[PDB]
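Notebook entry, structure prediction.
Reason for the run: the old model in the group folder had no record of what sequence produced it. Starting over properly, with the input documented here first.
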Amino acid sequence: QLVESGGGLVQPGGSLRLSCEATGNFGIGWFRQAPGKEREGIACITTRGRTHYAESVEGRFTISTDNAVYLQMNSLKPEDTAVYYCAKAIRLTTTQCVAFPGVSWGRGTQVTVSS
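New structure, fully documented this time:
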């Protein structure tokens, strides 16, 4: 029901905009997974437009809702290399972006930052 696009290969300092497009009307989060690491929630937005960012991307990435949710990725770093996924998510404070229970992960879009 959620479909990712917009990945690519970019030099350090570059910029990409990922899209998460719903097959119908629709909290949404962006997640990423690097080789050998756990999937991590990096940005999410509630049904009302309140956002949360992981510390690794705050100030460089922006999540925006339009039937699509975008991730504007500015000032890309090699450590941003990963497959990026979008899924229903909740902002869980104890504060993390957490995938909704029972979420089915799609295919995602590949992002590689290298010179």
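Summary: The chain has no helices and eleven strands.
The old model has been moved to the deprecated folder.
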